[PDB]
Design a protein around this ligand. Structure first.
Ligand code: NI
Length: 945
């Protein structure tokens, strides 16, 4: 007979399933090769289900690094009905088939939310690394044609809406992976894996010679042609097997006696596929690069510096057996540089549209399903499971000025005094790397020739009502006492030491990175910061290189060798979570010393759960490029949808084109602006406009200097515009800090793609170049040089108002909108209630005694004004105040609600001026606008407008 035919309180091994206190474990009845043997549904909350699966006959159940203990027990029922076993909470029903182990999720009325690949979507393949064992796992779900996906972290290919798309999940300077996706069907999936993972296609890309017949410039099969024109000397022409010069090993395949700086290289020929469909390409690049395929400019010019390269993707339909031309034009722009092109063969759209996860190494499959009423409610599930985001200190919501690098104490203090003397508001100033004696990275001591009195410096920063952040890497020179403390305990990764790697500083120094996965190493790492930096009064920690970035431009295999073994297992298994571990070290470290003082970290990598450690990510060493500016909009919106609500970027870009440096040097010498310097000023103007509406507003990068008065002088349009937006950030502070309060109290998200608030309007699904800043402002950056307008789509809504003029704009249409040099297009949603305060030089310079409450009429609205002490965790004990406000359009009524809570230093009495904007009343933004004066003492008042 068949395989099935042959094989209340009895042992569970006799039963198809076993119910425990919070879960059901089902034994797969029709076992397949590579398939699951056990599938568990564990109830974590009313809307929260933990799915586990394994090929073994028991679960390994390792402790999660990302999921925290939950607050309450959750009631649920289980029903077995033939092959179907269903776990039901008040809000969701999760079902599994005993036959296959396939899972699906419905709402309380049985409406489908998410279904596993029909017949099962889980595959297990054994893997062994360094005597440890686990599985490579695939999990695939069905996905309808109208499903849209957001999240995965922060990637640099300008992709937006991951439906039908691919992404590799590893960590590298500018690329932050978070294994969490949110759907427009109002659920999220969190994959609990720490290894290299993939969303979409589970395979690596292929070199061009593996998937195409190649013909060179003369038509000879078997290669492309490479033509190398050096800056000086004879041109070299050779055949190329493959275009793959992507890491330190493979750049040795470029021509041996041909200097790349100032060279112009052309790769060309024809490619011929053996199957028909959409081929998906990936370009890896540094220097200047363009790509043409079939005579189309598929990659218009991009640039990176020779040493932080990037990836960019494109796709094209190709016909089997037809030759099409391919040309890559490349200016390496350095002695070392990178260029590679790879591709994936076509995947049937029925399969490519599915939601597919691949994970290189875990002990079992673990994922979390979270349902919601809307996308904010999905994010709330993520915050329940991986921890709430604390309210950032209020000062973190102001302007941050940084540099790579302030070289001396005088330089740093001079920059800060420069803001105060010009009445350009600012809260935070940042000291970068190499403030230590050159040969002593990791000593945490200051070079006293350049910083003669570090404590006096921090005291002076504080006396000017500013806050200081300092750079701290996980990197230690081998000669330092601090290195030796880690090393003697086995807590330093050895590969970089064994291989005698030298860094880039001076003559080159030997170094290593500490193992953040070891809990005692974390304590020591914090203790060294506590003994050397904390007594100076430093307020914030810039935790750079937390990928960990042990060695730039190394291949996957060697990156794994460089960052393990770890305390928990191999680096193959524990590959992506370093920044989470490193952030725990500092957050739990500092609250251990002083539990009331707020913590701030800014870190270069990230992972699921990062937000629970009061830690933001910045988007890393990006270029001074319009295309990089555009990519940060989509990167930021995906990062926000990954559950982590504090994020920032280097306004202006980090690595600088040589022509911009030359422009600045010319300005310094002659006060004349060349064409490149004109572009520098416009790039920075537009990028500051954009940055004023991201969660943390921060300028940073390499030379030129980035203080606004260095970019352009007083009176120049660039200076005028940037100062306008820096001031506006502070007039918006009552609104902005209310959003910060909401991150903790309401599990809120600050920088929001349009799909969050306008999910019902599918025209927003692919829009990754506009966004909402809190509930009320729609921001549409200009990201092309010379443009004085741009196309904007206005979501379906009762209406929109131009912020600057108050002029009405209908919802549900796309049009060309004016965007002068000095202005970013900025609209306000009908129903907005927005509190604006007076000019201040820094957060809480003065109490917000007089607030203008702007009411943008035409729809109902709500807003809660949140205030607290700003600098400590007293809000956790109920020391804060909320003033809820509600506006009813039908009766034109505003209620300023009874104040809830109090705290030390709170205004008991204050003033509101209520200002209306409506379709018949185009009121420009104006602090002095005419309105209704309200003297408020905490008691409810009602206004009929
Ligand atoms: Ni020490």
């Amino acid at each position: 007979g068949s395989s099935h035919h042959h094989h209340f309180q009895g042992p569970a091994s006799n039963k198809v399933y076993e119910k425990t206190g919070d879960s059901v474990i089902v034994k797969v009845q029709h076992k397949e090769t590579g398939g699951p043997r056990l599938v568990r549904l564990q109830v974590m909350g009313d809307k929260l289900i933990h799915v586990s699966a394994t090929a073994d006959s028991k679960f390994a159940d390792p402790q999660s690094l990302i999921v925290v203990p939950q607050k309450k027990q959750t009631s649920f029922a289980v029903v077995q009905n033939g092959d179907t076993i269903t776990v039901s909470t008040e809000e969701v029903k999760a079902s599994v088939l005993a036959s296959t182990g396939e899972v699906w999720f419905t709402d309380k009325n049985g409406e489908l939310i998410l279904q596993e690949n029909k017949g099962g979507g889980k595959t297990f393949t054994p893997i062994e690394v360094e005597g440890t064992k686990g599985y490579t796992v695939c999990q695939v779900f069905e996905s309808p044609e109208d499903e849209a996906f957001y999240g995965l972290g922060q990637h640099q290919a300008d992709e937006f809406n991951y439906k039908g798309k691919n992404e590799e999940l590893f960590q590298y300077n500018t690329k932050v992976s978070v294994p969490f996706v949110v759907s427009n069907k109002n659920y999220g999936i969190l994959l609990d894996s720490y290894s290299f993972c993939r969303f979409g296609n589970p395979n690596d890309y292929s070199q061009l010679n593996r998937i195409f017949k190649l013909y060179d410039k003369t038509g000879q099969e078997g290669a492309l042609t490479g033509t190398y024109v050096p800056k000086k000397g004879e041109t070299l022409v050779r055949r190329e097997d493959s275009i793959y010069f992507e890491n330190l090993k493979t750049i040795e395949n470029l021509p041996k006696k041909l200097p790349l700086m100032g060279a112009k290289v052309t790769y060309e020929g024809e490619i011929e596929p053996a199957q028909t469909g959409e081929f998906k390409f990936i370009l890896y690049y540094a220097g200047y690069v363009k790509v043409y395929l079939n005579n189309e400019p598929v990659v218009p010019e991009r640039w990176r510096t020779a040493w932080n390269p990037n990836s960019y993707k494109f796709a094209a339909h190709l016909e089997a057996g037809k030759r099409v031309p391919l040309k890559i034009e490349w200016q390496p722009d350095g002695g070392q540089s990178y260029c590679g092109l790879r591709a994936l063969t076509p995947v049937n759209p029925e399969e490519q549209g599915k939601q597919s996860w691949w994970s290189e190494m875990t002990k079992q499959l673990d994922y979390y399903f979270m349902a919601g009423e809307n996308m904010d409610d999905v994010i709330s599930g993520y915050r329940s499971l991986t921890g709430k985001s604390p309210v950032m200190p209020k000062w973190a919501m102001g302007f941050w000025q940084s540099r790579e690098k302030y070289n001396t104490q005088e330089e740093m203090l001079g920059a800060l005094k420069g803001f105060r003397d010009r009445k350009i508001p600012l809260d935070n100033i940042v000291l970068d790397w190499n403030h230590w004696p050159e040969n002593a990275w990791g000593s945490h001591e200051f070079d006293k020739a350049r910083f003669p009195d570090p404590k006096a410096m921090v005291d002076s920063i504080h006396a000017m009502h500013a806050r200081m952040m300092i750079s701290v890497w996980p990197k230690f020179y081998v000669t330092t006492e601090h290195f030796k403390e880690f090393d003697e305990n086995g807590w330093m990764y050895q590969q970089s030491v064994k291989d005698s790697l030298k860094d880039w500083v001076g003559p080159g120094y030997h170094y290593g990175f500490y193992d953040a996965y070891d809990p005692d190493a974390r304590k020591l790492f914090w203790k060294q910061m506590y003994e050397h930096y904390y007594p100076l009064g430093i307020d914030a920690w810039w935790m750079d290189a937390s990928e960990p970035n042990v060695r730039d431009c190394t291949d996957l295999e060697y990156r794994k060798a460089l960052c393990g073994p770890t305390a928990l297992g191999s680096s193959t298994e524990f590959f992506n979570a370093y920044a989470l571990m490193n952030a725990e070290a500092i957050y739990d470290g500092q609250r251990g010393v002083d539990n009331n003082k707020r913590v701030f970290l800014l870190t270069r990598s990230g992972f699921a759960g990062l937000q629970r450690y009061s830690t933001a990510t910045w988007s890393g060493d990006i270029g001074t490029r319009w295309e990089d500016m555009k990519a940060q909009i989509s990167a930021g919106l995906n990062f926000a949808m990954s559950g982590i609500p504090y994020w920032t970027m280097d306004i202006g870009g980090f690595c600088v084109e040589n022509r911009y440096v030359a422009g600045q040097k010319q300005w310094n010498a002659t006060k004349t602006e060349n064409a490149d310097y004109k572009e520098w000023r416009e790039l920075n103007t537009r990028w500051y406009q954009f940055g004023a509406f991201v969660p943390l507003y921060r300028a940073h990068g390499q030379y030129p200097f980035r203080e606004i008065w260095e970019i352009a002088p007083e009176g120049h349009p660039a200076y005028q515009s940037v100062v306008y937006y820096t001031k506006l950030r502070y007039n918006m502070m009552p609104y902005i800090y209310s959003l910060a309060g909401m991150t903790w109290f309401d599990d809120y998200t600050i920088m929001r793609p349009l799909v969050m608030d306008f999910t019902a309007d599918a025209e927003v699904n692919d829009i990754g170049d506009q966004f909402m800043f809190g509930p009320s402002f729609m921001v549409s950056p200009v990201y092309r040089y010379g443009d004085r307008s741009r196309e904007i789509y206005f979501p379906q809504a009762e209406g929109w108002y131009d912020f600057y003029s108050g002029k009405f704009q209908a919802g549900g249409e796309r049009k060309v909108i004016e965007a002068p040099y000095e202005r970013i297009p900025l609209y306000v949603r009908a129903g907005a209630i927005i509190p604006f305060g007076d000019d201040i030089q820094y957060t809480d310079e003065k109490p917000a005694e007089h607030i203008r409450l702007y009411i943008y009429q035409g729809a109902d609205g709500e807003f809660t004004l949140y205030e607290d002490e700003g600098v400590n965790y007293n809000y956790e004990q109920g020391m804060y105040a909320m003033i809820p406000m509600k506006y009813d359009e039908a009766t034109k009524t505003l209620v300023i609600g009874e104040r809830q809570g109090e705290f030390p230093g709170m205004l008991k009495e204050r003033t509101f001026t209520v200002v209306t904007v409506n379709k018949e009343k185009a009121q420009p933004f104006d602090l002095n606008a005419k309105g209704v004066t309200v003297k408020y003492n905490g008691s409810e008042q009602t206004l009929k407008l």
